[PDB]
Swiss-Prot record, chain A:
Protein name: Thymidylate kinase
GO MF annotations in UniProt: ATP binding; dTMP kinase activity
Lineage: Bacteria, Bacillati, Bacillota, Bacilli, Bacillales
Pfam families, alphabetized: Thymidylate_kin (PF02223)
A GO CC annotation given for this chain: cytosol
Record organism: Staphylococcus aureus (strain MRSA252)
GO biological process, one term: dUDP biosynthetic process
UniProt-listed Enzyme Commission number(s): 2.7.4.9
SUPFAM superfamilies per the UniProt record, alphabetical: P-loop containing nucleoside triphosphate hydrolases
Annotated catalysed reactions: dTMP + ATP = dTDP + ADP
Keywords of this entry: ATP-binding, Kinase, Nucleotide biosynthesis, Nucleotide-binding, Transferase
Function: Phosphorylation of dTMP to form dTDP in both de novo and salvage pathways of dTTP synthesis.
Length: 197, 198
């Protein structure tokens, strides 16, 4: 089994990359694609609160992302890993660190303490970071707003801080390349990891 | 202003005590009494999720209590303290520490880290602990309204004892084994003594 998370800002080609990698990995592995809350009832109810809300306090929002994360982990990720599956998870702890911690200004270490309470030691076996420049990412967003551009840049700044501080489970993939190449580099990185157990 | 929380297991007479004490304090102070989620919409929605929880993971439950706590703090407690009010809050961080941390077995320090993220430095000025023995508490439970329940009740008390031993300075322990008229009087006097020193 393997718990593989995918991280990156919007415009990193993350959706395309996960779908294409899933289609190739399913040939050799029992694999699932998921994201939080991912159909878990309590997580879906939490997601409705976060969305069908207005000017929610950023720490309340962070705790709700963390609660949805735990429900998804316990009821969906862990049972799939127990079945021997390769779980491809679109966004996990690092999204809260970059978005809530860095971009929203709560502080990465404070948000880390919150998310370590939520995941209780269940860090990914491997994390693919789709390393897109702010400029390429901006173009992909318009293809697929001053405050939005700055928030997009802050998210990237946050991910850079996170990866600089920890580089073991993290594998950075050049997401400025055409998506065919991003898919190939991501697939090869995953296979290299999986074939080592 | 003053932020006063009330803590204790079930059977400590906490409901009766806070209501009576509040009724007395309003004569002399600008005071409000509240509890979580206390009508705050997001908090009420969180409460529904917790109550509808089928064998909910204890850490998810702890994060939901913490999220309800922050909504209630931000929308109700902090604005009242900014107006110079005395805020009487029925259950706060120490309920999560005793119930989620100690009794449920997550660990007090882990639940403290979670709740410190939620309250962001807003600890109570004073915490009234209604110190009832497990035996008196057990009897009040059977009067007001099994083995697993008795053990959980004892564990909650044990947790509160550990918490107060580690943070004696913030707590004022009131003998809750006394008849409730006396518990009300001792609680009221402890609060007045604190308030008249501000
Ligand atoms: C409000 O956050 C959402 C967004 C906004 N945004 C997109 C970029 C990622 C971002 N995000 C995502 C995660 C996982 C996290 O921990 N922190 C974040 O800030 C969330 C977009 C769609 C949905 C959406 O799902 O429609 C969404 O709601 C969610 C998504 C995941 C979990 C929860 Cl509780 C709510
Ligand atoms: C499931 O917890 C509840 C209980 C059970 N129990 C009673 C003893 C106190 C206990 N409790 C209370 C708080 C504040 C906390 O942080 N942790 C706890 O374990 C909660 C009783 C009534 C309600 C009730 O409100 O009907 C309730 O729901 C709540 C209470 C406060 C906050 C939230 Cl999110 C749900």
């Amino acid at each position: 089994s393997a718990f593989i998370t995918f991280e990156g800002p919007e415009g990193s080609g993350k959706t395309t990359v996960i779908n294409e990698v899933y289609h190739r990995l399913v040939k050799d592995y029992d694999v699932i694609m998921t994201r939080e809350p991912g159909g878990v009832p309590t997580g879906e109810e939490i997601r409705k609160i976060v969305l069908e809300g207005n000017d929610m306090d950023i720490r309340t929002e962070a705790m709700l992302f963390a609660a949805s994360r735990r429900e998804h982990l316990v009821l969906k990720v862990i049972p799939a890993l127990k079945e021997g599956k390769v779980v491809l998870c679109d966004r996990y702890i690092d999204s809260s660190l970059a978005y809530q911690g860095y971009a929203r200004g709560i502080g990465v270490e404070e948000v880390r303490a919150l998310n370590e309470f939520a995941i209780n030691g269940l860090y990914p076996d491997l994390t693919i970071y789709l390393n897109v420049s702010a400029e390429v990412g901006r173009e992909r967003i318009i293809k697929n707003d001053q405050e939005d551009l700055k928030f997009h840049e802050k998210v990237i700044e946050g991910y850079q801080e996170i990866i600089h501080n920890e580089s073991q489970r993290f594998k950075s993939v050049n997401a400025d390349q055409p998506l065919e190449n991003v898919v190939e580099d991501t697939y090869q990185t995953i296979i290299k990891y999986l074939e080592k157990i």
